[PDB]
Design a protein around this ligand. Structure first.
Ligand code: 4IP
Lengths: 190, 201
C-alpha cells in the first residue's frame, strides 16, 4: 500500500497543512492549488521538494519585501483627536524605520526605547479620549485598546525572541501587525 | 476577481514565477497548471501567495531535516536509473555514477569531522572526473538516438558540479551545512538525468 516515493514527502508534510488551513479562507483556491501540486507531483516525483527549496533560497527576496511593506505602513479637528492622530503617527513612523535600524545594535536599542515611549504616549492619549466618550458604545474602545496592547505585547515578545534568534523577518512582520492595530484604534472612532 | 497589480501581489512575480519558469523544462502542463493555479488564487485573494510563502518559510526546519534524510537515502536509489546496455563501457558508466552518488550520500555523516570531510571532498572530485571521463569515452565509441541531448545533459552536470564546488567554498565561510546537502542532492539528480538519457538515447 506504499508506492509513493520518499521525495514526495514535502507535499504532505509542508503543502497539505498549508492547503488545509487555506480551505477555511478560500475553499476554491485551496483545492485548485492542492490539485495543481498533486498533478505535478504525481507526474514528476520530486517537484514539490525542489519548489519548496527554491522558495527557501529566495528568503532574502521575502525579507526585502517584508521590509518595504513595513516602511510603507507609516504613510475631526477636535483637540483630543488631533492628539490621537499625532501619537499614532509617531509610533507608526518609528516602527517603519526598523528595517534600516536593526542592523546597528546600538541604534536599534534606542529605537526599541523610542517604540516603548511612543506606545506609552499613544496609550495615554487613548486613555484621554477614553475619559470623554462617556460609554457611547465605549465597549468597542476598551476592545480595540486591548487588541492593540495584545499585539504590543506580542511585539515585545517578538523582540525578546529576536535577541536570541536573530530572525529579523519576524520583527518586521510583528511590527507590521502593530501598525495595522494602530490604524484599527484610529478607525474604531466611527 | 481583482488584478494582481498591487503591492501585496509582488511575491507572486518576484518569487513564484521564476520558480515556475524552470518547470516548463520538466513538465509544461505542470508549470502551466501551477502558474494558473497561483494567479487564479491571487486574483481572488490578493496577498494569498505571500501568505503561502510565509507558511512555507515557517516549515524551514522540517524541510532542512528532510533534505538531509533525502541525501542519505540516495545511496539506495540506483536500479531505476541504471543503463540497460550490454557493452562493457555502459556497465562501467553505471559503476562510476553509483560511486559518485554513494560518496555524495555520505556527506551528512562526514561533514561533522573536518579531516574526514576534506578527504571526502577529494574523493568526490575524483569520482566526478572519472564519471566524466567514462561519459566522454562512451560518447566517442558508440552511436545514439539523441547525442545532442546527452551532451546537453553532461554540460548541465558540469554546471551543477561547479555549483557544488562553489557551495563548498561558501560552506567553509558561513558553516551552513544545508546548502551543501541541497547542492549534493541536485548533483545527484543531474547524475541520474545523465543515466536516464542514455537509457532512452
Ligand atoms: O540559521 P538558521 O536558523 O537556519 O536561520 C537563518 C535565518 O533564516 C536567516 O534569515 P533571517 O535573518 O531573516 O532570520 C537566513 O538568511 P536570509 O533569510 O537572509 O537569506 C539564514 O540562511 P542563509 O540565508 O543561508 O544565511 C538562516 O540560516
Amino acid at each position: 500500500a506504499e508506492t509513493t516515493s520518499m521525495v514526495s514527502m514535502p507535499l504532505y508534510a509542508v503543502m497539505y497543512p498549508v492547503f488545509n488551513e487555506l480551505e477555511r479562507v478560500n475553499l476554491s483556491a485551496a483545492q485548485t492549488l492542492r490539485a495543481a501540486f498533486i498533478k505535478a507531483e504525481k507526474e514528476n516525483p520530486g517537484l514539490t521538494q525542489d519548489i519548496i527549496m527554491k522558495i527557501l533560497e529566495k528568503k532574502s527576496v521575502e525579507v526585502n519585501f517584508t521590509e518595504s511593506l513595513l516602511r510603507m505602513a507609516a504613510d475631526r479637528p477636535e483637540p483630543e483627536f488631533q492628539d490621537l492622530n499625532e501619537k499614532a503617527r509617531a509610533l507608526k513612523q518609528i516602527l517603519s524605520k526598523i528595517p534600516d535600524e536593526i542592523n546597528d545594535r546600538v541604534r536599534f536599542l534606542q529605537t526599541i526605547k523610542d517604540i516603548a515611549s511612543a506606545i506609552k504616549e499613544l496609550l495615554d492619549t487613548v486613555n484621554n479620549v477614553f475619559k470623554k466618550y462617556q460609554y457611547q458604545n465605549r465597549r468597542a474602545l476598551e476592545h480595540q485598546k486591548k487588541e492593540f496592547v495584545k499585539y504590543s505585547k506580542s511585539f515585545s515578545d517578538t523582540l525578546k525572541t529576536y535577541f536570541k534568534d536573530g530572525k529579523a523577518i519576524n520583527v518586521f512582520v510583528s511590527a507590521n501587525r502593530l501598525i495595522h492595530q494602530t490604524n484599527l484604534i484610529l478607525q474604531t472612532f466611527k
